Paper text:
Native human TTR is known to be a homotetramer, or, more precisely, a dimer of dimers. The monomer consists of two four-stranded β-sheets, arranged in a sandwich-like tertiary structure in which β-strands HGAD are opposed to β-strands FEBC.
Two independent neutron datasets were obtained from the same crystal using two different diffractometers at the ILL. The first was recorded using the quasi-Laue diffractometer LADI-III (to a resolution of 2.0 Å), and the second was recorded using the monochromatic thermal neutron diffractometer D19 (to a resolution of 2.3 Å). Both datasets were recorded at room temperature. One was a quasi-Laue machine dedicated to neutron protein crystallography, and the other was a monochromatic instrument that is typically used for studies in structural chemistry, small proteins, as well as fibre diffraction studies of biological and synthetic polymers. Hence the results, which are closely consistent, are of technical interest for an understanding of the complementary scope of each approach. A comparison of the two neutron-derived structures showed close agreement; a superposition was carried out using Coot and the mean deviation was calculated to be 0.13 Å. The availability of both X-ray and neutron diffraction data allowed joint refinements, increasing the data-to-parameter ratio and reducing the influence of systematic errors. This water molecule mediates an important contact on one side of the dimer–dimer interface.
Author numbering:
A (entry chain B), B (entry chain B): 9 to 125
C (entry chain A), D (entry chain A): 10 to 125
């Protein structure tokens, strides 16, 4: 179904952060990051359809959010090159992961909401 | 329709914050707060149906979230008595307000997402 | 200092300077009584609000005037102010740092509580 | 100090003590080279990582070992670590404070940038 969803919000304008690039990677045996999935956030600041229950196996994942391009398109010089979220996916009953990020030019926060559907 | 919605998240457990009391007030002419609407967050940490476009007129509003009772039910001693969000509602084209709060025992953050439907 | 306030600006990556802060204490008749007030300095800090002797048990409210701050920068923000409400000194005297991180449509506030 | 890190614990309302921090600089061949490392003190701060002369223009990565921190408190947290990546000193030398506020399933990070 949809075990992984990303949501991005803009704290300066009080809006979804639209057309933000997101790349997802999975840690491979050799300790390097392999591309796993990517997309751009929608009008509601969300990114759905990244993966399926079948492919989303236990492992270490990295979500990379291209925040710098977002701010530059608004004419604001930002501090970070990108925002990175790194976590382990653990089976333990059925799980859905929502990775949220709240963006300002010199600060971001990120939260994980993990629920059972 | 639904011009005002509240969403509450628990940063300690990575979950919606369920059964949290929320009270909404409107500032009256005499500079005091009059009850306006209230409820408890649902299973998804959300509170819908607080008001309608007709009643939600321009004005100063206060959203009060009973965070202290939430933490005490989990057995954690919290710092704040409650979280308060105070803002002006301004007509200027059609607007929907989402007030989000992210809770920890000694810290909270709150964000407003304002969109046009 | 038993009570210190620190304010940061998340848009500019700087301390938030000249921000007005008002502190109140809940009185016997359940009203907010003015307790202390001041403005943040060039480091984003406000010291000297009170003393150990005056800072008795009670419920306190720290009100930060965020709206005037953003307006003076040309930004029309969402919140009227940020309010932090807490019970203080109920297990004996402590030192409190109230920190606030400001953006136009979002803020966060954290408390650091230390035993002298 | 050109580079300082400060870490707070949002669950306990305290500085986050004994947190391991590793700093890297992107080298010519696009790999991360170790630059400096240390542990936060009793005030949640890490000073002395570098000097003005050594801290040249570049892309730096500050990695904070949040997972070990929470595990030692008995809490199984979400993130493996917190990473902050930024270009430094590209318009001349500046002083950087990297602050992080930790909860088990959430963190925030802020930069304060000052011109000496």
């Amino acid at each position: 179904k949809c075990p992984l969803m990303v949501k991005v919000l803009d704290a300066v304008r009080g809006s979804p952060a639209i057309n933000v690039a997101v790349h997802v990677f999975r840690k491979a045996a050799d300790d390097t990051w392999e591309p796993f999935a990517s997309g751009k956030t929608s009008e509601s600041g969300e990114l759905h359809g990244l993966t399926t229950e079948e492919e989303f196996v236990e492992g270490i994942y990295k979500v990379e959010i291209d925040t710098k391009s977002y701010w530059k398109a608004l004419g604001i010089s930002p501090f970070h090159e990108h925002a990175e979220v790194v976590f382990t996916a653990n089976d333990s009953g059925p799980r859905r992961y929502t990775i949220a990020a709240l963006l300002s030019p010199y600060s971001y926060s990120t939260t994980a909401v993990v629920t059972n559907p």
